[PDB]
Each structure stands twice: as structure tokens, then as C-alpha cells.
Amino acid sequence: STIEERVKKIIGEQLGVKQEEVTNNASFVEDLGADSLDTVELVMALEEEFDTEIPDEEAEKITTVQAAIDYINGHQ
Ligand SMILES: [Zn+2]
Ligand SMILES: [Zn+2]
């Protein structure tokens, strides 16, 4: 599996949407129906999945599937 698939699976699990809905362009709030706690636990999920802390200022930009992928990739 790849980081990309791992990220999409997590967003899927966390936002309760089927995998096909987790497109690279998809916006968590606008497109995937996320509310505040959803975006907070998603980032929390990504930190545990990849065993790494995500600083708040970087986390705030993780608003789309692609942004989540780019952050994790950029951090190894
Ligand atoms: Zn990859
Ligand atoms: Zn949209």
C-alpha cells in the first residue's frame, strides 16, 4: 500500500464516506460533509497512523484530500 492509499482510507474512515468519494480534489468540509470535530479527529487520525505530530499552522491547510497527501509525503 502507499501513503496516498493510507491517507484516503483514513479520510474515508474518518469522514464516513465511501472510497470513491475520496477524490484527490475533494474538500473535507465543502465536499465531504465534515464538521469541526471531523476535521480535528481526521488530523488526529493522520498523526497516529503515521506516528507524527502535525503542527497547527500546517494542519490548518490540510483542507483537501490532496493537501493531506502532500503534507504526509513532504514529511517523508
Ligand atoms: Zn506514495
Ligand atoms: Zn466542492
Report all structural domains of the chain as residue ranges with CATH numbers, in order of start.
1-76 (1.10.1200.10)
Question: Catalytic amino acids?
Answer: 35
Q: Which residues surround ligand 1, an ion (CB under 5 A)?
A: 2-4
Going by C-alpha positions, the residue among 73, 68, 76, 72 that lies closest to residue 25 is 68
- Which residues have a Cβ under 8 Å from the Cβ of 64 and sit 6 or more positions away? 24, 25, 26, 27, 28
CA 67 – CA 26 distance, rounded (Å): 10
**Which experimental technique did the depositors report for determining this structure?**
X-ray
Q: Cα of 4 to ligand 1 centre, how many Å?
A: 5
Q: Which three cell numbers stand for residue 34?
A: 465534515
**The residue to which cell 488530523 is assigned:** 43
Q: What are the residues whose beta carbon lies below 5 Å from ligand 2 (ion)?
A: 30-31
31 Cα to the center of ligand 2, angstroms: 5
